[PDB]
Structure 1
Amino acid sequence: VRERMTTQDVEAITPQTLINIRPVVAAIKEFFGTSQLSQFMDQNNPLSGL
């Protein structure tokens, strides 16, 4: 955002033209999949779920 802020011309931009949410959703999906802390719910019985 700060990078393209200077490269973009005035009176022609909008937050839709400024913001890339692709790295944000990539960070969310990169945490929920393929982390250490995200885990398959070990659920052979409800006590192991709990």
Structure 2
Amino acid sequence: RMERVVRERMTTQDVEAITPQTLINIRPVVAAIKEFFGTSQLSQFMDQN
């Protein structure tokens, strides 16, 4: 998802002005990791009785 967004913006962005700081959107990675650890079937509360 990050790559898709990066390349779309790169195409829209003007050349000789942009930088990976202006290309990378880090929202998708954070969203994915969050939706994995929280709100997932395979990340369960450690049953510790």
| TM-score, normalization by structure 2 | 0.83
| C-alpha displacement of 1:15 | 0.3
Q: Is the radius of gyration larger for structure 1 or structure 2? A: 1
**What RMSD over aligned residues (CA atoms) do the two structures have, in Å?**
0.5
Give the gaps of 5 or more residues in structure 1.
44-50
2:29 to 16, 19, 24: 24
Task: Report which structure shows greater RCO (CA 8 Å, sep ≥6).
Answer: 2
Q: CA deviation at 1:11?
A: 1.0
Q: Matched residue of 2:40: which SS? A: coil
Runs of 4+ in 1 over 4 A off after TM superposition: none
- The secondary structure found in structure 2 opposite 1:26 is helix
TM-score (norm 1): 0.82
The CA distance in 1 between the partners of 2:20 and 2:30, in whole Å, is: 17
Give CA deviations for 1:1-43 in whole Å, capped at 9, x if unaligned. 1111110001110101000001110000010000000000000
